[PDB]
């Protein structure tokens, strides 16, 4: 499943992301679009970013896993166990700024013009 921008914007406040850990929706919108284009489905180091969030095993998953999940629940149509483990990592203590694509790109900007339209 690639989303689009206001399906994807609907499932994320769905999940509770809308103001989580501080960070209003947009800068989640924002982070999906340039980690996999919105793609349910996506070494250098270890080895391989999961899904639409781009979450690596090295840490996050197994494929000692943090967020107690396989891998492969970071790759179905539906954006949920994904979600989880966003949960999680946002809350290590470097916030979004986990999220490289998310410091280069959407940290700072305008983040809710990715809300805006829909
Ligand atoms: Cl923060």
Same mark, same amino acid.
């Given at each position: 499943?690639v989303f689009?921008?206001?399906? @994807?914007?609907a499932?994320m406040?769905?999940?509770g992301? =809308? $103001? ?6 947009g800068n989640?919108?924002?982070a999906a679009?340039f980690?996999?284009?919105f ?6 180091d270890?080895?391989? =970013?999961?899904?639409?969030?781009q979450?690596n095993?090295?840490w996050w998953?197994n494929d000692? $896993? @943090?967020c107690? *999940?396989?891998?492969?629940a970071l790759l179905?149509? =539906?954006?949920?166990?994904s979600?989880?483990? #966003?949960?999680? *990592?946002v809350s =290590?203590? $470097?916030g979004?700024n #986990?999220?490289? #694509?998310?410091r280069?790109?959407?940290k700072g900007?305008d983040?809710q ?5 829909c």
């Open positions: 499943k689009g921008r206001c399906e @994807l914007a499932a406040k769905r999940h992301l =809308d $103001n989580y850990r501080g960070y209003s929706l989640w919108v924002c679009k980690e996999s284009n793609n349910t489905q996506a070494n250098t270890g080895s391989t =970013d999961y899904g639409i969030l979450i095993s090295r998953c000692r $896993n @943090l107690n *999940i396989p891998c492969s179905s149509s =539906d954006i949920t166990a979600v989880n483990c #966003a949960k999680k *990592i =290590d203590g $470097n979004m #986990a999220w490289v #694509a998310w280069n790109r959407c900007t983040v013009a990715w809300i805006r339209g």
